[PDB]
Each structure stands twice: as structure tokens, then as C-alpha cells.
Paper text:
TcXyn30B is a bifunctional xylanase with endo‐glucuronoxylanase and exo‐xylobiohydrolase activities. The present study provides insight into the mechanisms of substrate recognition of a bifunctional xylanase.
The present study determined the crystal structure of the TcXyn30B‐product complex. A 4‐O‐methyl‐α‐d‐glucuronyl moiety‐binding pocket required for glucuronoxylanase activity and Asn‐93 (which is likely involved in xylobiohydrolase activity) was structurally characterized.
Author numbering: 18 to 473
Write the structure that this text describes.
Amino acid sequence: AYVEFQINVDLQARYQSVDGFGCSQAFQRAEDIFGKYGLSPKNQSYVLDLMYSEERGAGFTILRNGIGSSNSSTSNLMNSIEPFSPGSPSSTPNYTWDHYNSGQFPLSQQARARGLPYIYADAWSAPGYMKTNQDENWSGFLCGIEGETCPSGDWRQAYADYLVQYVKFYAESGVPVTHLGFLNEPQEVVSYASMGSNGTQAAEFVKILGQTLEREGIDIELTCCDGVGWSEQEAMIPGLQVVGPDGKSAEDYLSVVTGHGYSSAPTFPLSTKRRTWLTEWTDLSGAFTPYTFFADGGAGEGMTWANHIQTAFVNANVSAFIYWIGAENSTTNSGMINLINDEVIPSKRFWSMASFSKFVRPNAQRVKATSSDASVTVSAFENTNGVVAIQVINNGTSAASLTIDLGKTHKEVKKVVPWVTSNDYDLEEMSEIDVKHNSFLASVPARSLTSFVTEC
Ligand SMILES: *[C@@H]1O[C@H](CO)[C@@H](O[C@@H]2O[C@H](CO)[C@@H](O[C@@H]3O[C@H](CO[C@H]4O[C@H](CO)[C@@H](O)[C@H](O)[C@@H]4O)[C@@H](O)[C@H](O[C@H]4O[C@H](CO)[C@@H](O)[C@H](O)[C@@H]4O)[C@@H]3O)[C@H](O)[C@H]2NC(C)=O)[C@H](O)[C@H]1NC(C)=O
Ligand SMILES: *[C@@H]1O[C@H](CO)[C@@H](O[C@@H]2O[C@H](CO)[C@@H](O[C@@H]3O[C@H](CO[C@H]4O[C@H](CO)[C@@H](O)[C@H](O[C@H]5O[C@H](CO)[C@@H](O)[C@H](O)[C@@H]5O)[C@@H]4O)[C@@H](O)[C@H](O)[C@@H]3O)[C@H](O)[C@H]2NC(C)=O)[C@H](O)[C@H]1NC(C)=O
Ligand SMILES: *[C@@H]1O[C@H](CO)[C@@H](O[C@@H]2O[C@H](CO)[C@@H](O[C@@H]3O[C@H](CO)[C@@H](O)[C@H](O)[C@@H]3O)[C@H](O)[C@H]2NC(C)=O)[C@H](O)[C@H]1NC(C)=O
Ligand SMILES: CO[C@H]1[C@H](O)[C@@H](O)[C@@H](O[C@H]2[C@H](O[C@@H]3CO[C@@H](O)[C@H](O)[C@H]3O)OC[C@@H](O)[C@@H]2O)O[C@@H]1C(=O)O
Ligand SMILES: *[C@@H]1O[C@H](CO)[C@@H](O[C@@H]2O[C@H](CO)[C@@H](O)[C@H](O)[C@H]2NC(C)=O)[C@H](O)[C@H]1NC(C)=O
Ligand SMILES: *[C@@H]1O[C@H](CO)[C@@H](O[C@@H]2O[C@H](CO)[C@@H](O)[C@H](O)[C@H]2NC(C)=O)[C@H](O)[C@H]1NC(C)=O
């Protein structure tokens, strides 16, 4: 039989596990979803379903929340649980919990109500009084870190205790945090919340925080360091791997190494022994590209992001992919879903994320998938429950007729369902295809993404 394009999936060649997909709603953008700029109650629930319902939407499984460093909630600041200095590092801190966290607490409740497992809390900065520059903004260093003393003393343990208290407020209010980070883009010196550290400076604090959590009996997965690009994060990993005089490295305490895609993209594997996450990335150009899956390779096009995701898993070995803002009242590409007062416009970047997230569920494993032609790129995952999800990007200008072989399985696959994303389709379910001897034929449209989902 003639075969235009051959795709081979091998469930016996298995790679990294998957924790999931999602976004952030930091810097008060969570409040947008709850009607800050006029979103109706109908569309508040619609947006939450698009984001977090596996049946009605993308079923995102990770939410990245900001641990606020600010002493007010003006402009788009995230306010802190410890807005004012206790005076000295050993003084008893005064903590305030507002059951809100710039809208991120009710958002977390709503995501969890729809099944979201993972909440990643990440600080952009320690509160300013803990830092060398006495300012949450413009970088600066945690007082007491190697090379960075402060006249007010050593604030390292105070910052660790502060992060523990943020996590405790969440758990006591019924919303446990599962992943915890204490830096964002430590390379960056910017006008908003920021804080520095190289690899060895980050490692120093990782060990302090991990030992604090063990003393407190809190089970949580520690991350580092949300570097501004993939290569920039890779450069911190040697410092995280130095085994100190106590016989431990920071990597021993870490569960996930995290990085962003801005300064360099996740296109190669990081050299840690831990799982890695792409934890922030978007199109910050200011363009507005809601409807385009492919036109000319613009940074905000749907295919661009379908390919960013597929590459991050296949070539950069990540276990999760977290966009920047999910939904926001803007007309730029910074968020996946544009809100225009009481109007909801999910972009093709959203639908590309949804194609992956709806069918590649937590604890899935990536498996080998190859393509006979460079115009068709493939990825494949086997879920806990046996469902196999195969993502195919056809960048040809014509439809492509695929022969897809699933190899040896321990129970023959009998049906598979395609779900297509393109200039014409958001996430459109096609007719089921019969599978014979673990092989099936399928045509995919020009310039498109298709998720093929097997039935158990
Ligand atoms: C599928 O196959 C197609 C070809 O058929 C490939 O399409 C090309 O994709 C590349 C990106 O990979 C495109 O190049 C990029 O174009 C962006 C959009 O340009 C439009 O808008 C600008 C405004 O300046 C117009 O001038 C232009 O004519 C277009 O209308 C640019 O914004 C990009 O620039 C950015 O990246 C470059 C390179 O790093 C930087 O130098 C820039 O400063 C900026 O940061 C870039 O030039 C290209 O246009 C596409 N070609 C065609 C014919 O469409 C897809 O890449 C491929 N997809 C996959 C997944 O393989
Ligand atoms: C909740 O959010 C939704 C989604 O954003 C809001 O509904 C949109 O409201 C805006 C205005 O606020 C409308 O924008 C107008 O669109 C006109 C063109 O609309 C046609 O083309 C659309 C492109 O696909 C299409 O979706 C739309 O179909 C919808 O409306 C038809 C007419 O009532 C109806 O027959 C369909 O079944 C479907 O409901 C039209 O064919 C344009 O000419 C205007 O200038 C303006 O831009 C959107 O059309 C609305 N979209 C939908 C799907 O309703 C909604 O108001 C928000 N609030 C509530 C309470 O629901
Ligand atoms: C892709 O990422 C995965 C993580 O998602 C990497 O998996 C890691 O692989 C290393 C092997 O090089 C495992 O380390 C080994 O651990 C055992 C004990 O568990 C130890 O005895 C060995 O000496 C070695 O340290 C590590 O466990 C594993 N991590 C996970 C979370 O499974 C994988 O290596 C990455 N692939 C590439 C090409 O980088
Ligand atoms: C539509 O507004 C968006 C801004 O255009 C966009 O720059 C961004 O601004 C945020 C800023 O986000 C950072 C983007 O770069 C990343 O490297 C970094 O980790 C992010 O923190 O964060 C600080 C905040 O003050 C800015 O408003 O996102 C805006 C948005 O709401 O989407
Ligand atoms: C509240 O936070 C603001 C912002 O970090 C603090 O103001 C900064 O203070 C430093 C140190 O004096 C200055 O270098 C910056 O210029 C200030 N920034 C701004 C925007 O004013 C302020 O000190 C904090 N207040 C309290 C009581 O902690
Ligand atoms: C919230 O979104 C609305 C709708 O996009 C914004 O209002 C528009 O703003 C642009 C300029 O940025 C104007 O061209 C439109 O005429 C405005 N429309 C309306 C109905 O006012 C609004 O500015 C956004 N607000 C925030 C804080 O982001």
C-alpha cells in the first residue's frame, strides 16, 4: 500500500512524565475574570470553564500565582501578607491574610472546583525591607545571602518563614499549594517586583527553605529559578548542583527546575536530574492576533504556539508548559484569551494550548513518535488511563494523508478521534476513525494542528 506520510508511535520507548499545562493570573489579572472591567457573570463562568473544565474547555491543570511583595494594591501590584517590616529579622512578624491575594485566591478555588490539581506559588521578590535596596523593585538581593549583607541584619530565615506562612494561609483556607518558588527572572532589573541571585546564591536559599519545610512538616515541591530564558536558567544549574560541606546540593531539595522562554526558547534539555517546567512565555510585542493560526509566522499566531509547545516537550524535555496570562482585559497577545469588557475572544494560542491540555493529562508519559517528512511534526503521550494522545502539526500548504502506526500495545486500539485546530477550526472534533492492527489512516488539513485521541 502507498504511504504519503508515515508516522510511527512506539509506546515501548518512553521519556519524561507530564505534570500539565496552564497559565498565570498575576498582577491583578485574576480580577479581570471576576468582572473587574465589566465581564458578565455568564462570561465569568464561561471563561473559568474554558480554562479549567476538561469537558467544556482546556482543562488546564497548573495555575501559577504570585506571592505578592507590595505594601499596597495600587496600579497592578500584588499586595503582601507581610506589608510592613517587623523591625528586625528576629522580631515577631505581623501577617495579614485577605482571602484574596489579588484575585488569585478565589480563582484558585474556582479552578480546584473544576479539578485543577497543581497550584504553583511564585514570588517575584521578597518584601522590600528584607532586601539590600530596601525595595521590592529594581532587583536587589535578599539580606544575608552570600556577598550581600545589610545593616538591618540577616533576613534569609525570615523570608523562608514568610513563604511558609503564605502557603499555610492557603492550606488553612482549603486551597493547598503544591509547588513553591521564591524567585522570578533573577537576571532581570526592572521597575516592578524583582530580586537577584546567581546559581550559587539561589542554591543557598533553596537549602534554607527546604530545611524549613522539613522542620514544619509541610509537603510541597520546591522550584528554581524561573530564569528569563532557557539558556539563562541552564547557566544557574551548576550552582544548584554543588554538593556543599553538608553533603547536599540545592538540587537535592528541588522537585522542578523552572524557566521562561523570553530570552531563549526551550529547544534543548536542561542538565538537571529533575523534571523541568516551562513556567512563563507569551508574545509581549503588543500585536493583536486573536484569530490567526497561520498567516506569516507572526509571534502571536496559533501555529507558532502549537510549535513552541510541541518543541518544548519533544526537544526540550519539559514536563509542563505554563503560558503567561490566561485571560485579561486587553487587546494584545500577552494573554491567551482577550476580554473586551463583557466579551470573550479565545485566541488560537489558547486553542493550541487546549489541544494539548485537554488530552495530555497529569502523569502522562511522552513516548517516541517519528515522522517521515519534515512538513509534518509529531509528538505523542500515553496517559495513566491508557488514552494515547498524538499531536500532529501539518505545515504543508495542502492536506496531508498520514499512515499512523501505533506499534505494539497490550490491548489493540480500535478507535481514534481527531480534534483539529487551524484558521478554520478552534478545537473541532472530527468523526472517529477505525484502527486495524494498531494502524490507521487520516488526512489532516493544510497549516493545522490535529490531536488524535485513542479510545479505551
Ligand atoms: C511553517 O512554514 C512557514 C513557511 O511557509 C514558516 O513561516 C515563516 O515563519 C517565520 C518565523 O518562523 C516568519 O518570520 C517571522 O515573521 C514575523 C512576522 O512578519 C510579518 O510581520 C512583519 C512585520 O515586521 C512583516 O515585515 C512581514 O512581512 C510579515 O508580514 C516577524 O515578526 C519575525 O521577526 C522576528 O524574528 C526575526 C528572526 O528571529 C527577528 O529578526 C525579528 O527582529 C523579529 O524578532 C520573523 O521574521 C516568516 O515570515 C514565515 N514565512 C512565511 C512565508 O510565511 C513557519 O515558520 C513554519 N512553521 C513551523 C512551525 O515550522
Ligand atoms: C459574553 O461573551 C460573548 C462572547 O464575546 C458576547 O457575545 C458577543 O458580543 C459581541 C458584542 O458585545 C458581538 O460582537 C459583534 O459581532 C458582530 C458579528 O457577529 C457575527 O459574527 C461572529 C463571528 O463568528 C459570530 O460569532 C456571531 O454569532 C453570534 O451572534 C449571532 C447574532 O445574534 C447569533 O445568531 C449566533 O448564534 C451567535 O450567537 C455573528 O454571526 C459585529 O457585526 C459587531 O460589530 C460586534 O463586533 C459578538 O457577535 C457576540 N458573540 C457571541 C458568540 O454571542 C456576549 O455579549 C457576552 N455577554 C453575555 C451576557 O453573553
Ligand atoms: C528528561 O527529563 C527527565 C526528568 O523529567 C530526566 O530524568 C532523569 O534521568 C536521570 C538519569 O540521567 C535520573 O537520575 C538517576 O536517578 C537514580 C535514582 O532515581 C540514581 O540512582 C541515578 O544515579 C541517577 O541519578 C533521574 O531520576 C530522572 N528524573 C526523573 C524525575 O525521572 C531525563 O534524564 C531527561 N532527559 C534528558 C535527555 O536530559
Ligand atoms: C497587557 O499588559 C501586559 C504587558 O504588556 C506585558 O509587558 C506584561 O507586563 C507585566 C509584566 O509581566 C512580565 C512580562 O515579562 C516576563 O519576563 C516577566 O516574568 C513578567 O513579570 O509583569 C509586571 C507587570 O507590572 C506588568 O504589567 O503583562 C501585561 C499583562 O497584564 O498581560
Ligand atoms: C512600600 O513599598 C514601596 C515600593 O517598594 C516603598 O517605596 C520605595 O522605597 C525605597 C526605599 O526608601 C525607595 O528607594 C523607592 O524609590 C520607593 N519606591 C516608590 C515607588 O516609592 C516603600 O518604602 C514601602 N513602604 C513601607 C512602609 O514599607
Ligand atoms: C478594558 O478593555 C476595553 C475594551 O478593549 C478597553 O476600552 C477600549 O480602549 C481602547 C483604547 O485602549 C479604545 O480604543 C476603545 O474605544 C475602548 N473601548 C471602550 C468600550 O471603552 C479598556 O481601556 C480596557 N481597560 C483596561 C484597564 O485594560
